[PDB]
Amino acid sequence: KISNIFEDVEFCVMSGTDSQPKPDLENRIAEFGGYIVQNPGPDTYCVIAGSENIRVKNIILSNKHDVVKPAWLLECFKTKSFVPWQPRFMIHMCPSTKEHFAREYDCYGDSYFIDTDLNQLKEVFSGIKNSNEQTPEEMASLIADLEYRYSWDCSPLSMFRRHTVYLDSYAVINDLSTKNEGTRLAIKALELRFHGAKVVSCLAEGVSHVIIGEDHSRVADFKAFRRTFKRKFKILKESWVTDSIDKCELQEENQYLI
Amino acid sequence: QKENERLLRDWNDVQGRFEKCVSAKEALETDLYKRFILVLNEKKTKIR
């Protein structure tokens, strides 16, 4: 009666009680001129149901129509007009509608006509299952590559992703009989991991920096290793790491000059 | 001894809470990055 656009279209509202009683939905769709049929037929544009029954499961098997949620009907009611179908209601959908969506929409809730705000993007991300399939090294490397490709590593909170600073908190190698209790090495580890840097205790070929604690009186080994190692290491003053707490600011590139 | 011991208990508690908060922040950053990477790969495939 109100929205005549719903006329000339069959709606198989064969269920739906959890949200609103099904007779109420039928009354509303009649007020909107929707064809209320009690069973699916090869002329119904969409099948409307609430709780999922063996009939819905068979329609999933016998792909004849789409199992549209009543929430889409509620959207039509609040909009008082037709609501375009979105990949969040149809539990089962016909292959023709699948091709229609794929031709002008992504495989996820993202759409080219309706943008996703903060909450919609959050819902899209949550709907995508979260698991572990990528190794931490590879995932961090891809993150760094994408950030450098479009200048995202310049965030003031995460700059130590590339700088894998090695902290020589162990005086001896392969000795489990000692434990540094009550030391500030944990504080240094927390400071390093705040910006994304992850410390390592096993030496490998991926470590390009060697940093010792406050015991800087070991300049002799640094001098000896400068002649030996071609990988000229860079050691800065301990005030720079404390600047992340006192100044809490990054260091500009103008300091690196002649 | 009593003063330094309950201050060291407070230090242990603050270390634990800071560690768990930093771990939660890192997990949120990691899974947000994972989801953004997935959607970015989806969009890259669509662009291609």
XYZ file of C-alpha atoms in Angstrom:
306
model
C 0.000 0.000 0.000
C 2.734 2.430 1.018
C 5.707 1.187 -1.023
C 4.259 -0.133 -4.281
C 7.767 -1.090 -5.440
C 7.472 -4.328 -3.437
C 4.468 -5.280 -5.563
C 4.862 -7.579 -8.583
C 7.550 -9.411 -6.566
C 7.001 -12.658 -4.666
C 8.344 -12.973 -1.117
C 8.436 -16.385 0.571
C 8.231 -15.265 4.201
C 7.845 -18.836 5.407
C 9.352 -18.314 8.875
C 10.729 -15.664 11.212
C 9.725 -15.369 14.860
C 12.874 -14.621 16.904
C 12.882 -10.934 15.950
C 9.183 -10.307 15.267
C 6.193 -12.638 14.881
C 5.802 -13.920 11.339
C 2.176 -12.672 11.028
C 3.448 -9.177 11.841
C 6.007 -9.464 9.040
C 3.290 -10.658 6.661
C 1.071 -7.729 7.646
C 3.915 -5.266 7.099
C 4.842 -6.714 3.707
C 1.173 -6.610 2.699
C 1.137 -2.954 3.745
C 4.097 -2.747 1.364
C 2.304 -4.942 -1.171
C 4.549 -7.990 -0.906
C 3.255 -11.308 -2.217
C 2.894 -13.576 0.823
C 3.312 -17.168 -0.374
C 3.496 -20.045 2.100
C 5.935 -22.174 0.081
C 8.798 -21.441 -2.332
C 8.117 -21.412 -6.042
C 10.122 -20.691 -9.188
C 8.864 -17.116 -9.225
C 9.880 -15.894 -5.747
C 12.719 -13.377 -5.806
C 13.784 -14.258 -2.254
C 12.862 -16.626 0.577
C 12.491 -15.137 4.059
C 12.922 -17.298 7.151
C 14.004 -17.041 10.769
C 15.142 -20.241 12.444
C 16.804 -22.654 10.044
C 14.787 -25.746 9.134
C 15.234 -28.825 6.975
C 13.419 -26.850 4.282
C 16.173 -24.224 4.378
C 18.794 -26.979 4.351
C 17.146 -28.504 1.277
C 17.098 -25.106 -0.441
C 20.809 -25.011 0.360
C 21.024 -28.421 -1.306
C 18.420 -27.685 -3.996
C 19.692 -24.208 -4.839
C 16.450 -22.482 -5.820
C 16.320 -19.192 -3.892
C 18.195 -17.221 -1.233
C 17.854 -17.594 2.543
C 17.630 -13.907 3.451
C 17.668 -13.002 7.133
C 14.724 -11.092 8.640
C 17.239 -8.373 9.530
C 17.215 -7.371 5.860
C 13.435 -7.095 6.148
C 13.911 -4.904 9.219
C 16.307 -2.787 7.153
C 13.640 -2.457 4.463
C 11.106 -1.467 7.130
C 13.281 1.220 8.714
C 14.299 2.503 5.275
C 10.642 2.272 4.155
C 11.973 1.167 0.757
C 14.029 -1.530 -0.943
C 17.388 -2.370 0.634
C 20.132 -3.650 -1.708
C 21.298 -7.137 -0.817
C 24.523 -7.315 1.174
C 26.781 -10.343 1.755
C 25.701 -10.593 5.393
C 22.066 -11.815 5.318
C 21.833 -14.601 2.735
C 22.997 -17.765 4.483
C 22.497 -19.518 1.154
C 22.373 -17.713 -2.163
C 21.930 -18.701 -5.789
C 24.973 -18.906 -8.089
C 23.532 -16.131 -10.261
C 23.485 -13.819 -7.247
C 26.997 -15.043 -6.421
C 28.213 -13.923 -9.845
C 26.274 -10.668 -9.474
C 28.041 -9.960 -6.180
C 31.468 -10.985 -7.488
C 31.074 -8.744 -10.542
C 30.551 -5.596 -8.455
C 31.522 -6.501 -4.870
C 34.421 -8.115 -3.068
C 34.216 -11.582 -1.543
C 33.787 -9.838 1.829
C 31.332 -7.264 3.151
C 33.227 -4.422 1.480
C 31.126 -2.812 -1.249
C 31.830 -0.346 -4.046
C 28.573 1.563 -3.464
C 28.312 1.591 0.353
C 31.518 2.446 2.183
C 32.359 0.786 5.495
C 32.886 3.101 8.460
C 34.914 2.273 11.571
C 32.261 -0.073 12.968
C 31.494 -1.703 9.610
C 35.183 -2.328 8.942
C 35.524 -3.747 12.457
C 32.630 -6.116 11.767
C 34.151 -7.124 8.422
C 37.476 -7.886 10.108
C 35.802 -9.842 12.914
C 33.775 -11.877 10.427
C 37.032 -12.871 8.760
C 38.363 -15.660 10.960
C 41.651 -14.941 12.730
C 44.262 -17.696 13.003
C 47.990 -18.324 12.529
C 49.098 -19.192 8.993
C 52.085 -16.872 8.385
C 55.403 -17.114 10.195
C 56.216 -14.124 12.440
C 59.375 -13.308 10.478
C 57.593 -13.344 7.114
C 54.589 -11.414 8.438
C 56.841 -8.762 9.998
C 58.863 -8.525 6.777
C 55.728 -8.008 4.678
C 54.471 -5.434 7.186
C 57.760 -3.542 6.937
C 57.752 -3.723 3.134
C 54.192 -2.399 2.878
C 54.890 0.332 5.440
C 58.030 1.473 3.610
C 56.236 1.316 0.251
C 53.715 3.958 1.386
C 55.593 5.575 4.315
C 53.836 3.995 7.290
C 56.960 3.085 9.295
C 57.184 6.776 10.284
C 54.662 6.175 13.073
C 56.110 7.653 16.298
C 55.255 4.525 18.319
C 56.755 1.761 16.137
C 60.166 2.343 14.554
C 62.212 -0.589 15.936
C 60.693 -3.270 13.683
C 63.766 -3.315 11.440
C 66.318 -2.572 14.193
C 66.760 -5.968 15.862
C 68.962 -4.728 18.700
C 70.805 -7.569 20.427
C 71.101 -7.116 24.198
C 74.042 -9.040 25.683
C 72.395 -9.658 29.044
C 74.343 -12.928 29.429
C 77.954 -12.783 30.585
C 78.457 -16.500 29.880
C 77.161 -18.760 27.110
C 75.041 -21.887 27.696
C 74.857 -21.821 31.495
C 71.463 -22.277 33.158
C 72.725 -22.252 36.768
C 72.424 -18.449 37.061
C 69.471 -16.065 36.963
C 69.729 -12.262 37.063
C 67.006 -11.469 39.595
C 66.051 -7.880 40.348
C 67.982 -6.483 37.376
C 66.910 -3.771 34.943
C 67.484 -5.976 31.883
C 63.746 -6.707 31.949
C 63.111 -2.953 31.805
C 65.355 -2.707 28.738
C 63.522 -5.629 27.123
C 60.166 -3.946 27.774
C 61.464 -0.681 26.309
C 62.715 -2.500 23.206
C 59.455 -4.424 22.744
C 57.360 -1.272 23.208
C 58.437 -0.033 19.761
C 58.239 -3.519 18.208
C 61.858 -4.655 18.535
C 62.139 -8.265 19.687
C 65.307 -9.391 21.445
C 67.040 -12.695 20.708
C 69.286 -14.810 22.921
C 70.686 -17.181 20.267
C 73.303 -15.857 17.855
C 72.608 -16.360 14.150
C 73.452 -14.708 10.832
C 70.448 -12.367 11.002
C 71.852 -10.324 13.880
C 73.608 -7.220 12.547
C 73.966 -5.276 15.820
C 75.674 -6.108 19.114
C 74.762 -4.000 22.152
C 76.208 -4.551 25.627
C 74.747 -3.258 28.877
C 76.091 -0.417 31.007
C 79.443 -2.265 31.148
C 80.987 -0.201 28.354
C 84.530 -0.749 29.676
C 84.808 -3.545 27.062
C 86.055 -1.234 24.296
C 88.998 -3.596 23.692
C 86.857 -6.269 22.039
C 85.077 -3.618 19.954
C 88.457 -2.324 18.763
C 89.648 -5.854 17.976
C 86.435 -6.680 16.094
C 86.551 -3.458 14.050
C 89.663 -4.705 12.245
C 88.223 -8.221 11.910
C 84.549 -7.686 11.062
C 83.753 -5.844 7.847
C 80.248 -5.193 9.242
C 81.039 -1.867 10.882
C 78.613 -1.725 13.809
C 77.118 1.513 15.128
C 77.032 2.216 18.865
C 75.282 5.306 20.231
C 75.279 6.777 23.718
C 72.934 5.415 26.374
C 71.158 8.790 26.476
C 69.464 8.047 23.141
C 67.490 5.083 24.488
C 66.542 7.146 27.552
C 65.302 9.870 25.185
C 62.364 7.588 24.345
C 61.239 8.055 27.969
C 62.445 11.577 28.765
C 61.913 13.244 25.387
C 59.596 10.481 24.083
C 60.306 11.803 20.580
C 62.010 10.521 17.456
C 65.367 11.812 16.231
C 65.349 13.709 12.947
C 67.688 12.989 10.039
C 69.275 16.459 10.220
C 71.494 15.231 13.069
C 73.239 12.846 10.640
C 75.543 15.293 8.851
C 79.266 15.898 8.355
C 63.448 -5.121 54.981
C 59.676 -4.801 55.244
C 59.741 -1.524 53.279
C 61.892 -2.817 50.433
C 60.071 -6.152 50.297
C 56.599 -4.705 49.811
C 57.990 -2.148 47.373
C 59.547 -5.062 45.479
C 56.188 -6.859 45.544
C 54.653 -3.702 44.066
C 57.445 -3.682 41.480
C 56.720 -7.312 40.601
C 53.008 -6.539 40.258
C 53.640 -3.502 38.052
C 56.066 -5.533 35.928
C 53.419 -8.213 35.465
C 50.646 -5.774 34.599
C 52.887 -3.809 32.223
C 53.971 -7.045 30.534
C 50.399 -8.267 30.067
C 49.211 -4.855 28.842
C 52.069 -4.661 26.331
C 51.316 -8.219 25.206
C 47.645 -7.330 24.702
C 48.603 -4.218 22.729
C 50.993 -6.264 20.584
C 48.321 -8.908 19.955
C 45.795 -6.252 18.924
C 48.344 -4.647 16.608
C 49.244 -8.055 15.157
C 45.693 -9.191 14.435
C 44.706 -5.779 13.058
C 47.731 -6.048 10.765
C 46.694 -9.582 9.791
C 43.150 -8.492 8.930
C 44.383 -5.454 7.003
C 46.864 -7.648 5.123
C 44.068 -10.061 4.212
C 41.792 -7.287 2.954
C 44.715 -5.650 1.131
C 45.517 -8.925 -0.636
C 41.832 -9.260 -1.527
C 41.853 -5.758 -3.009
C 45.161 -6.424 -4.793
C 43.661 -9.507 -6.432
C 40.585 -7.478 -7.378
C 42.770 -4.742 -8.892
C 44.784 -7.312 -10.843
